[model samples]
Target: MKLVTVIIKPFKLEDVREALSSIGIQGLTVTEVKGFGRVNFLPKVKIDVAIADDQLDEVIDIVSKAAYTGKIGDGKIFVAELQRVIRIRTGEADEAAL
Candidate 1:
């Protein structure tokens, strides 16, 4: 499995969410976050999604396009390997659990 985490400008969150939903992907975990750098500190939105490894690139692309604003602080996308995924109530696991 893969974990896709994207940090983006706050104003673009809705656009990213809608784009993901249109592609039949829902159930993301979203958190309002703040980030700081050498010369900037800004409010950002962090979105987390888990899916099969094969879906990683496509998801990243979707988020990038939807969140694009042609300016600095557009933010970043990170992908990591997830060792496992499980649903506590139903016992679903891995991609199915996602």
Candidate 2:
């Protein structure tokens, strides 16, 4: 499994969500985050998605295009190996947990 983390401007959250949905990625967790730069703090939206290894590129492409604004502070996407996943109630694991 793969863990996809995307941090982008708050305003772009909706667009990113839509893009992911269009690509058939429905499960994700979103959180408000703050980043410290030289002058002040910047507001950002962080999205976390767990997907099969084969779906990495497609998810990345959708997020990149949707989050791009042709300017600075577009935020970033991080990809990592998911060690494990589990559901609380059903005890589902792996992708099923996601």
Candidate 3:
């Protein structure tokens, strides 16, 4: 499976959430975080959080698409391979964890 972590501007949270929900993505893990990125050799703070991976392309696409608002501080998207996903209560994996 894949884990997608997106760090975006705070203002675009609602937009991204709505877009993901509209596509029928049922769940996500969100964290309020802070980080910085560089553009044109300049680093800036991105006061946003990350939405954990859901293994849904539509959800990821929705996030990436909506996170952009034609601004310099829109932030970044990071993706990685997840070896496994386990549910806390049921010991479920993959979609079950999703």
Candidate 4:
């Protein structure tokens, strides 16, 4: 599995969310986080999503386009490998976590 995390300008939240939803992806998180971008500390929204490894590039691309701007501080995307995923209530696991 892969974990895709996006840190983007706050103004792009709805655009990103709608774009992802249009692609039928769910289970994403948003956080109003403050951090360094380019130079000064900035207010940003962090989006976190977990999906199958095969979905990695698509997720990154979707986030990239959704988060893009011709301006600086368009922000960053980070990815990490997730060893496992499971539903807390049921027994569904792995890629089914999507």
Q: Which candidate's lDDT is highest?
A: 2
- Rank candidates, lDDT, best first: 2, 1, 4, 3
The residue-by-residue lDDT of candidate 1 on 44-98, one tens digit each, is 9999988887787789888899999999889999888899999989999887788
Q: Looking at candidate 2, what is the lDDT of residue 8?
A: 97
lDDT of 3: 0.63
Q: What is the Cα-based lDDT of residue 81 in candidate 4?
A: 89
Displacement of the residue 81 alpha carbon in candidate 1, Å? 0.2
Better of 2 and 3 by TM-score: 2
lDDT of 4 by residue, 1-98 (tens): 88888999999998899878877786798989998756887899999988888888887888789879869889898999888988887878887666
Query: Which pairs clash in the backbone of model 4?
Result: none
Rate residue 47 of model 4 by lDDT.
Answer: 93
- Listed in order, each prediction's TM-score against the native is 0.92, 0.93, 0.70, 0.89
Cα lDDT over the full model 4: 0.86
Q: Of the pair 2 and 4, which is ahead by lDDT?
A: 2
lDDT of 2: 0.92
Please give, for residues 65-92, the per-residue lDDT of candidate 2 as tens digits: 9999988999999999998999999999
Q: Show model 1 residue runs off by greater than 4 Å.
A: 37-40
Worst ten in a row by lDDT for model 3: 42-51
- Residue 48's C-alpha lDDT in candidate 2? 96
Q: Hey, what RMSD does candidate 3 come out at?
A: 4.9
